[PDB]
From Swiss-Prot, chain B:
Protein name in UniProt: Spike protein S1
Recorded consequence of changing T13K: In strain: Omicron/BA.1
Function: Attaches the virion to the cell membrane by interacting with host receptor, initiating the infection. The major receptor is host ACE2. When S2/S2' has been cleaved, binding to the receptor triggers direct fusion at the cell membrane. When S2/S2' has not been cleaved, binding to the receptor results in internalization of the virus by endocytosis using host TFRC and GRM2 and leading to fusion of the virion membrane with the host endosomal membrane. Alternatively, may use NRP1/NRP2 and integrin as entry receptors.
Organism of this sequence: Severe acute respiratory syndrome coronavirus 2 (2019-nCoV)
Subunit relationships: Binds to host ACE2. RBD also interacts with the N-linked glycan on 'Asn-90' of ACE2. Cleavage of S generates a polybasic C-terminal sequence on S1 that binds to host Neuropilin-1 (NRP1) and Neuropilin-2 (NRP2) receptors. Interacts with host integrin alpha-5/beta-1 (ITGA5:ITGB1) and with ACE2 in complex with integrin alpha-5/beta-1 (ITGA5:ITGB1). May interact via cytoplasmic c-terminus with M protein. May interact (via N-terminus) with host bilirubin and biliverdin, thereby preventing antibody binding to the SARS-CoV-2 spike NTD via an allosteric mechanism.
Residues of the full protein shown: 535 to 582 of 1273
Amino acid sequence: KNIDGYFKIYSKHTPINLVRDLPQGFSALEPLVDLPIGINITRFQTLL
Amino acid sequence: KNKCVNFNFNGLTGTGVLTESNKKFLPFQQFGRDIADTTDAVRDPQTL
Ligand SMILES: *[C@@H]1O[C@H](CO)[C@@H](O)[C@H](O)[C@H]1NC(C)=O
């Protein structure tokens, strides 16, 4: 989330055993990064 | 420690007695709060 030009990045890694979709349940994501880019973001893309 | 002091941690001001905690702050955390919205515990900027 980019708020007031703040790029806040939270994340979480968890082991899973499922090939269908998101496992049903609950787990919280801890903050990792806050970048002061001051840059408006309207779109994004993924790279594999 | 173990004395009444006027403490200022990175601008977080208050008055109290500083004692060794048994709390488990997460890697990103700086200071705790109480139900009253008062600082209950802190992390030293110079020592983790
Ligand atoms: C949004 O764009 C404007 C362009 O004037 C800029 O001043 C502002 O800092 C930007 N804010 C964010 C959310 O990065």
